[PDB]
């Protein structure tokens, strides 16, 4: 699928359809301040192609939205390369939201979760965030509906059964799989995968990559002559050059600007 830039969607649902072909959002996604929307506007609205967001996901004051299970059913990774003040996921004053329902979310690579002041919001106690984030210590999940009657066959962790909705369990893989994910039969995804795969032990069948993405494959590092871009994909010189001619090269990365003490040889940063 297509790589889209970060988006800020407000007021109307019109611009939301700009996500229709994105597999990856290279940036953040903010959806906010939709006062006129009602449940009927979301009933048949879905972006099943979205697998990953490199920065953060933020939802604030979106009326009529009761779950995210149909909007982002396949969102698997939020990388958190850039954060919203230290948060990779923000759900705030979502007045009609009854559940998150991000039943494919397996990993938040960097940052924390802030879920606050969502009257109506249930199915939070049923999520084991320690399976999704290395540290839950900085999570801030308060002032939500959470007696909820969170009814979940589901895995149990410390003990409580874990689910996203009445019809979706939280996926938990054998410990040997680590963060790589597994198939329904419990077979580990390849060590370069992150979260999930269509087939076991194949780096071309990953839903997302643990390290970097190149040529339909998950790789540990970008080898020369490719450069690390946006901390998730490998790009060639020409690509970095095209960005520059409306970006620089430093330490095998294509980056926005030369660090302190460096200047650009006309595309390599030199001291």
């Amino acid at each position, epitope marked *: 699928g297509e790589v889209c830039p970060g988006m800020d969607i407000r007021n109307n649902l019109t611009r939301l359809h700009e996500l229709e072909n994105c597999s990856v959002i290279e940036g953040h996604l903010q959806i906010l301040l939709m006062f006129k929307t009602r449940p009927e506007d979301f009933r048949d609205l879905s972006f099943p192609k979205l697998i990953m967001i490199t920065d953060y996901l933020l939802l604030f004051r979106v009326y009529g939205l009761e779950s995210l299970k149909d909007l982002f059913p396949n969102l698997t990774v939020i990388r958190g390369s850039r954060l919203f003040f230290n948060y990779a996921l923000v759900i705030f004053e979502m007045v009609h939201l009854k559940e998150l329902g991000l039943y494919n979310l397996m990993n938040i690579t960097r940052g924390s979760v802030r879920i606050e002041k969502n009257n109506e919001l249930c199915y939070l106690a049923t999520i084991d965030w320690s399976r999704i984030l290395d540290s839950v210590e900085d999570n801030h999940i308060v002032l939500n509906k959470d007696e909820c009657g969170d009814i979940c066959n589901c895995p149990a962790t410390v003990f409580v059964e874990r689910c996203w909705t009445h019809s979706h369990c939280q996926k938990v893989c054998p410990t040997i799989c680590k963060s790589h994910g597994c198939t329904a039969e419990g077979l580990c995804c390849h060590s370069e995968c992150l979260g999930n795969c269509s087939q076991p032990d194949d780096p071309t069948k990953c839903v997302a990559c643990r390290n970097f993405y190149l040529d339909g494959r998950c790789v540990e590092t970008c080898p020369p002559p490719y450069y690390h871009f946006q901390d998730w994909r490998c790009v060639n010189f020409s690509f970095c050059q095209d960005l520059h001619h409306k970006y620089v090269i430093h*330490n095998n990365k294509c980056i926005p600007e030369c660090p302190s003490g460096y200047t650009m040889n006309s595309l390599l940063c030199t001291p």
Partner: antibody
Amino acid sequence: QVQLKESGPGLVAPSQSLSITCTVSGFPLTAYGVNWVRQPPGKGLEWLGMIWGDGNTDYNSALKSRLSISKDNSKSQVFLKMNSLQTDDTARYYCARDPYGSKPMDYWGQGTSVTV
Amino acid sequence: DIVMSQSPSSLVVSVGEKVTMSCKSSQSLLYSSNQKNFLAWYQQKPGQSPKLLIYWASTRESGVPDRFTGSGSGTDFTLTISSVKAEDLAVYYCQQYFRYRTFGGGTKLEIK
């Protein structure tokens, strides 16, 4: 499951060209690199060149002038062509899978014995 | 271009003995981005194709016995066989894969 096999001509007259087809299976040429390495009888390994998933190539700086590597992703084939062979080009020629951002050349073909 | 220099060119050893062999690169193979060395070791048994043993200078390929250990960083690398087995007779090659590939001269493992 991963396989690579070279189809070479066996014999080349001095000053003629060498053409070899490496047919692969079990992985996509779009996601893996394929190199060509040769070994003169009882001598070491000489890296000749490679073709990346994107079709870009890298050739041995010493033999850059004599080599061409091309491929057909849909037919799972990689093609080597070398200009004006001489007796010292007598060697076994191998094609091998290069998973570029992970491990160096892993799966090798049994090579094609080529005699000038 | 990177020159890979292997030592010794040949050696004779008995079954059970430890063997150490060297590979020196003309320039550092240490990749700043991951702090790994872009070096591999291959074993070529008589009449066979090369087989990958080690990559990233010290990571053992799946199926490779624990008796094989790769070490070193930057320019100077070592392959050690803790206790040689009869099946280990082969020529051992190092290869750099940083930019393009280059092989050493190979150390020859003879067994008496």
